Amino acid sequence: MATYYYALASQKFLLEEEPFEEVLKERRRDYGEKNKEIDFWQVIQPAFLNAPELAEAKAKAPEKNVAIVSTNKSFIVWVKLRLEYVLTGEFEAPSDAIPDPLASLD
C-alpha cells in the first residue's frame, strides 16, 4: 500500500489550462529521458472518489471531474499552487474501497 495525493478539477476547468497540460506532457517525456518511473497520472472521472473516506470531496466535486494523482506529495503541492481551483487530498491504496487508484468510472 502507498499514499496517493490528488488534485481534483472539473473537466471544464482543466480544458482551460493547456499550458499546465503541456507541463505534464513535458514531465512525462523528461521522466522517460531520465529512466524515472512515472509516479503521476491524470485520471478522468476517478473511481477513488467513491471511497467512503473521500465522501466530503465527492460532495463538493464537479459532475464531470478529473484528477491529477501522484505518490509524490510535493508534486501535488505544486499542482495546487499552479491551478488553485482544485480540491486536494490523499488516500491509501490499494484498499477494498480503492482497489485501483488510477481507475476511471467511464
Author numbering: 1 to 106
The authors write:
We crystallised the WT Ycf54 protein and solved the structure using molecular replacement to a resolution of 1.3 Å. Synechocystis Ycf54 is composed of a single domain (annotated as the Ycf54 domain in PFAM), in which a central four-stranded antiparallel β-sheet (β1–β4) is flanked on one side by helices α1, α2 and α5 and by helices α3 and α4 on the other. This domain appears to be typical of the Ycf54 superfamily, with Synechocystis Ycf54 representing the most complete and highest resolution structure to date. An additional conserved structural feature is an electronegative ridge that extends across one face of the protein. This ridge is located on α2 of Synechocystis Ycf54, where two of the highly conserved residues, E22 and E26, contribute to its negative charge. Although individually point mutating these residues to alanine yielded no discernible phenotype, the fact that the ridge is unusual and structurally conserved indicates that it may be of physiological importance. In WT Ycf54, R82 adopts two clearly defined conformations, both of which form stabilising hydrogen bonds with neighbouring residues. In one conformation, R82 forms a water-mediated hydrogen bond with the side chain of W78, and in the other R82 forms two direct hydrogen bonds with the backbone carbonyl of F20 and the side chain of E17. On the WT Ycf54 structure, residues D39A and F40A are not particularly surface exposed, so we are unable to speculate as to how these mutations result in a reduced interaction with CycI.
Mg-protoporphyrin IX monomethylester cyclase (MgPME–cyclase) catalyses the formation of the isocyclic E ring by cyclising the methyl propionate side-chain at C-13 to the C-15 bridge carbon between rings C and D, generating protochlorophyllide (Pchlide). Recently, the small monomeric protein Ycf54 was identified as a second candidate component of the MgPME–cyclase. The Ycf54 protein has been identified as a component of the MgPME–cyclase complex.
